[PDB]
């Protein structure tokens, strides 16, 4: 039966507004699981031009505390996107023993972008890399910011699309804003 | 908790063999391997019975997933599973080679083919039964239907040596590539 260990990962870069749309979604995102060393366990990373781990998988063995946790999260900023960094950190140092990670335990990971990453030329292998440690991923691509600003979104869509695992209909989430991000909770959560 | 021995079919009609070290690679980097957890230790037979490596001879998941991706395949035309799972309870699950008094004993046979020795199984089974040996079995049709040979006498003879309920422990798997696609649920069962 069920057992999981899941890291989000999330692009903190400014163009991201509001963040509380994005601490919304981690609450009602978080809220609906069963939090604990014998259950789920959630970590976060957030990244933008370096990567910060906001709290380990065992750091907090209730739901009660993840949600606290969760709403204290700040956004970091940063110039560069460096998606490849943060997924690669998190599969690296968030995903290891020494911070929580279950050995048998099946590994979730979950990517809240809002634009292409600086250092997309490693998203090739780093992805590689988790799916070969069978890191499931869901991708979530918020166009908010690039329509605002009237940038095209195709090469954006397809790179987040790129990070999904397979199939891709089923792990990727195009959300139009951040307002939106709350949206997709339910069908997220029902798919983990 | 649990003292598992694998024993593995070695002969050269599975095909190909990276099929099965896969499988013992998922299957295994899922467990907690140590002295005060999980033991596993594997033998493999053909015509002959070799014992890769015995149930104490690692004491962390990752020392067995190294050793197990490093386990060639030795061929053999003649399928002494009766010999290869006899060996493995007079052998493998003994003190000498790390089995641990009082735990639970689990074996995990995978062959593709009816054996040789099948005259002697019916014995071999119950003194497995004798000693609470609890047996999954894994039958794979691979070789079988490639060559075009009918698979019900195949199948009835893998399916007695598992413990029953068969349901519980036996595992039909069409051919070798399709291995892999039962490690979650065979390693939900042990
Ligand atoms: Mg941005
Ligand atoms: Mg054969």
Request: charged share 25%; proline share 2%.
């Amino acid at each position: 039966s069920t057992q999981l260990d899941i890291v989000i990962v999330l692009d903190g870069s400014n163009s991201i507004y509001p963040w509380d749309s994005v601490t919304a979604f981690l609450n009602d995102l978080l809220e609906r699981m069963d939090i604990g060393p014998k259950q789920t366990q959630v970590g976060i990373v957030q990244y933008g031009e370096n990567v910060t781990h906001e709290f380990n998988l065992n750091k907090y063995s209730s739901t009660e505390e993840v949600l606290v946790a969760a709403k204290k999260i700040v956004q970091r900023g940063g110039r560069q996107t460096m998606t490849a960094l943060g997924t690669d950190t998190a599969r690296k140092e968030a995903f290891t023993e020494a911070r929580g990670a279950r050995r048998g335990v099946k590994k979730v990971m979950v990517i809240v972008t809002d634009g292409e990453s600086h250092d997309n030329h490693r998203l090739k292998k780093v992805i590689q890399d988790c799916e070969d440690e069978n890191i499931q991923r869901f991708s979530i691509a918020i166009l908010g910011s690039y329509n605002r600003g009237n940038l095209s979104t195709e090469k954006f869509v397809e790179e987040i699309k790129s990070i999904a695992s397979e199939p891709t209909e089923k792990h990727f989430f195009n959300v139009s804003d951040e307002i939106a991000l709350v949206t997709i909770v339910k069908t997220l959560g029902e798919r983990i």
